[PDB]
Design a protein around this ligand. Structure first.
Ligand SMILES: CCC[C@@H](C)[C@H](N)C(=O)O
Ligand SMILES: [Cl-]
Ligand SMILES: [Cl-]
Ligand code: NA
Ligand code: NA
Length: 243
């Protein structure tokens, strides 16, 4: 009876929408926690007197400890300050030392921090030295208008993937390239799975707009929404409305 099917459809829409929100929140809160951390670090570095910031030895001795304590406080992989001479002061998981081999002026985290007055957030990428996938938060630090260097903080992208996977619902994230990035059902991360149906249904319907689509000639229901450069989706079987 249409009345019954409408009731089930309105219920499941609300539910699935709510769960999609949870996944959206997860991504937002991950980012903002890392941003706040980075901002606080910026502030403590810029607070130092110039004298502590204007020689490399002073950077080592005065900024290094700050990098280290901050790194430990959140269990970041790397926390670092890149200088215009190409050297980096690096605090890494497993005192901080100056490194001259990290080709920083070719790195987006460095370049892009100098082109915005905000924190820059990279797509996930393979960390040069630790060979883990990371998301980097970078920020050009200025003390009274004078550039000191570019701060970077590397957080394992697995941390976000794990958070998303724990969420209720069959929710998942695509990265900026529409490749699968995280999922509650680990099987979805098969790079051979085609997601065209879901992605085409999202493109037709827009953010947070519930839709029908087919899998193996069965009916499924879902929704997606943009969250920063990610696309977050939920889908379920339409058996809840049909049977
Ligand atoms: C070993 C620190 C690497 C940092 C500077 C950064 N993750 C990069 O790959 O450029
Ligand atoms: Cl993020
Ligand atoms: Cl952002
Ligand atoms: Na958080
Ligand atoms: Na991305």
């Amino acid at each position: 009876d249409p009345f019954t099917k409408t009731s089930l459809y309105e219920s499941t829409l609300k539910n699935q929408t709510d769960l999609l929100k949870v996944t959206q929140s997860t991504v937002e809160d991950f980012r903002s926690t890392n941003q706040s951390f980075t901002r606080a670090l910026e502030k403590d570095i810029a607070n130092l007197p110039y004298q502590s910031l204007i020689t490399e030895e002073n950077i080592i001795n005065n900024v290094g400890p700050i990098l280290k304590y901050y790194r430990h406080s959140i269990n970041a992989l790397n926390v670092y300050l890149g200088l215009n001479n190409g050297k980096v002061l690096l605090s890494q998981k497993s005192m901080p030392e100056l490194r001259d081999d990290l080709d920083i002026k070719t790195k987006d985290w460095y370049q892009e921090a100098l082109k915005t007055n905000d924190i820059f957030v990279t797509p996930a990428y393979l960390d040069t030295v630790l060979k883990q996938y990371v998301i980097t938060y970078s920020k050009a630090i200025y003390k009274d208008g004078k550039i000191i260097g570019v701060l970077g903080v590397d957080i394992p992208s697995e941390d976000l993937q794990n958070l998303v996977a724990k969420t209720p619902g069959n929710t998942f994230l695509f990265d900026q390239k529409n490749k699968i990035f995280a999922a509650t059902n680990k099987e979805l991360l098969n790079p051979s799975i085609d997601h065209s149906p879901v992605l085409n249904a999202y493109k037709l319907n827009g953010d947070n707009n519930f839709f029908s689509y087919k899998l193996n000639n069965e009916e499924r229901l879902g929704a997606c929404t943009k969250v920063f450069a990610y696309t977050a989706c939920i889908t379920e079987s339409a058996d809840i409305i049909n049977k």
